[PDB]
């Protein structure tokens, strides 16, 4: 959720939230339409991941 | 017969009426047929998230064999009772003690 850094936190350098997922999860529903969409998505990514 | 794992959550504020409620509930079930293998009345417990901004409400678990009638009349007592919030009844369990 939020930063909650220790006592010498400097000029607000977000150590926790930079590690966090950030705008990825924000984008994830965002992208226009979804209902027909992920039918062609399946397996083609996973098929790439071989030696 | 079917073993039921019942749990309900009752108002924090009404806790002096709580033992009166536990007696009248378990009486109405066990009078018919029902038989207690777990009955627990947890006391106050701060919520993980606050249900409609309510707080600290009591949890009350049971594991009872029962006929299909008295769990219906209990569930409709839960839909009736305006001092009780969330309620569940679940599968067999087959008799338990603590782990709370």
């Amino acid at each position: 959720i939020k930063v909650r850094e220790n006592e010498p936190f400097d000029v607000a350098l977000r150590r926790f939230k930079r590690s966090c997922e950030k705008a990825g999860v924000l984008a994830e529903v965002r992208r226009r339409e979804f209902y027909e969409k992920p039918t062609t998505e399946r397996k083609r990514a996973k098929a790439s991941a071989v030696k | 017969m079917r073993h039921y794992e019942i749990v309900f959550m009752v108002h924090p504020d009404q806790s002096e009426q709580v033992p009166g409620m536990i007696e009248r509930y378990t009486a109405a079930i066990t009078g018919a047929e029902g038989k207690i293998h777990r009955l627990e009345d947890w006391g106050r417990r701060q919520l993980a998230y606050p249900i409609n901004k309510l707080h600290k409400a009591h949890y009350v678990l049971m594991n009872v064999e029962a006929p299909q009638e008295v769990i219906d009349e209990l569930e409709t007592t839960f839909r009736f009772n305006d001092a009780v919030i969330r309620s569940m009844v679940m599968r067999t369990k087959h008799a338990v003690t603590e782990a709370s």
């Binding site: 959720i1 | 959550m9 998230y49 969330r86 569940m88 679940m90 782990a99």
Partner: protein, 54 residues
């Protein structure tokens, strides 16, 4: 085994937001993960552990 009243344990499988840790990560096997996720929704329902805070 897979009781939702295992709330001491189920904390290990949630991040700060209360989102679930997936089956790749946790050292589980596919059956126990389904029962785990089912138990987490039950724990989430009673406010023993949270759906998410926010």
């Amino acid at each position: 085994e897979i009781d939702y009243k295992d709330i001491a344990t189920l904390k290990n499988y949630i991040t700060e937001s209360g989102k679930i840790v997936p089956s790749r990560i946790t050292g589980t096997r596919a059956k126990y993960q389904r029962q785990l996720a089912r138990a987490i929704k039950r724990a989430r329902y009673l406010s023993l552990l949270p759906y998410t805070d926010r």
